[PDB]
């Protein structure tokens, strides 16, 4: 039984250095929401240095719809930039995970999820699409023959249906146990009390802290952390 | 005897439409100095529509040196973005031509020319590097085994050594004859009166005008306009 741990990098924030020592996959910003070519270049090198799988963390450039075509184009632009930077160093970009609001909206909007999946596919069919467990992005991914991996969160509360409870409450290190529960037996205790089934193939480790202690403690609690090799 | 004509596009300016009807190669902006992913996406489609060779027009993001490493990284970022957008449409990016100040400075600074050439090579060794005739960029290109094409200008005055006279005077449609002279016999009458030898493998057509008349008139004057197939 293996589990993949991923962290967002290329934002210049937090300590990407130490976090790359305890994570199996990296999601590198592509210059829109954060980072730049030079930062992307240094993140890739550090990633290969630690044997971490290189992945892109594309983002968007009051819910005004941005046509799927535009998102598709902007996604290609970002992941193609990183893939080229990665290959220049003899590295290979292995996955793509949307960032923030793009990720959040693609989780519920089929059209947006579809746009992102198509872009990942158009870049390289062998790329693994990472998205929130049980969301539209996972659906879009498998819809196009893309290997897809579902993401779960250690510090977030889940509903009965298996999705997250809207931030706040929808307008403690119990996280460990929740994380261990999802990875080991694919289920999580919802805030409603009922058990909800989940895929949990990768857990997102927040490094923006001293929140680095939880990361290492999570691994101590853990069996075998490894990159997605589907 | 063939000649290649190129035009800068993806800047939203001028009439890229009509210019793509009389040019053999296109240099598409990559989102830094101008353009964006969507614009790049539409330019590529129009390029394949007119059978025009797709090329990148990367730029920089009081001559303060930007380390070659940075330029290298930023160049990869831009041309990799366009190459991915191009391939997504079943197209192929064929050449790279630096934009404005980056082009202007790489013409004289070996280190900068070297950085750009290495980036083009790291992206795809089969890419044609385009630079000012007799400049450092052409040298850097052939230095790395890259097919290189020298650019000449119809509306600019040349010196005896074969380089351009600094803008203004260095702090008429005679252009046609000058252009015909360079393409047909590889030489140009300098403002000093002496004949200067040049490679002239491609001429840059300014479409930012009614300067489109000169473009068509240049072709009327011309034999066989074709893309670089070295």
From Swiss-Prot, chains A, B:
Entry keywords, A to Z: ATP-binding, Hydrolase, Nucleotide-binding
Gene3D superfamilies: Glycoside hydrolase/deacetylase (3.20.20.370)
InterPro entries linked: Glyco_hydro/deAcase_b/a-brl (IPR011330), LamB/YcsF/PxpA-like (IPR005501)
Keyword ATP-binding part of the UniProt annotation: yes
Domain of life, source organism: Bacteria
Transmembrane annotation, as ranges: none
Phenotype on disruption: Deletion of the gene slows growth on minimal medium with ammonium as nitrogen source.
Enzyme class: hydrolase
Chain's role: Catalyzes the cleavage of 5-oxoproline to form L-glutamate coupled to the hydrolysis of ATP to ADP and inorganic phosphate.
Family membership: Belongs to the LamB/PxpA family.
PANTHER family recorded: 5-OXOPROLINASE SUBUNIT A, UNCHARACTERIZED PROTEIN YBGL-RELATED
Protein name per UniProt: 5-oxoprolinase subunit A
Organism this protein belongs to: Escherichia coli (strain K12)
């Amino acid at each position: 039984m293996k589990i993949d741990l991923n962290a967002d990098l290329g934002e210049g924030c937090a300590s990407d250095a130490e976090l790359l020592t305890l994570v199996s996959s990296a999601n590198i910003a592509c210059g829109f929401h954060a980072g730049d070519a030079q930062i992307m270049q240094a993140c890739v090198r550090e990633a290969i240095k630690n044997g971490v799988a290189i992945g892109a963390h594309p983002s968007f450039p009051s819910a005004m719809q941005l046509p799927p075509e535009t998102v598709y184009a902007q996604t290609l632009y970002q992941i193609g930039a990183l893939a080229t930077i990665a290959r220049a160093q003899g590295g290979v970009m292995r996955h793509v995970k949307p960032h923030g609001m793009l990720y959040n909206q693609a989780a519920k909007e089929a059209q947006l999820a579809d746009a992102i999946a198509r872009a990942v596919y158009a870049c390289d069919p062998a790329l693994i699409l990472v998205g929130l467990a049980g969301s539209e992005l996972i659906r879009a991914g498998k819809q196009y023959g893309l290997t897809t991996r579902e993401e779960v969160f250690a510090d977030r509360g889940y509903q009965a249906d298996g999705s997250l409870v809207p931030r706040s409450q929808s307008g403690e290190e119990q996280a460990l146990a929740q994380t261990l529960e999802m990875v080991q037996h694919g289920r999580v205790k919802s805030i409603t009390g009922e058990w909800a089934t989940v895929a949990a193939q990768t857990v997102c480790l927040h490094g923006d802290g001293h929140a680095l202690a939880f990361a290492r403690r999570l691994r101590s609690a853990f069996i075998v952390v490894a990159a997605l090799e589907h």
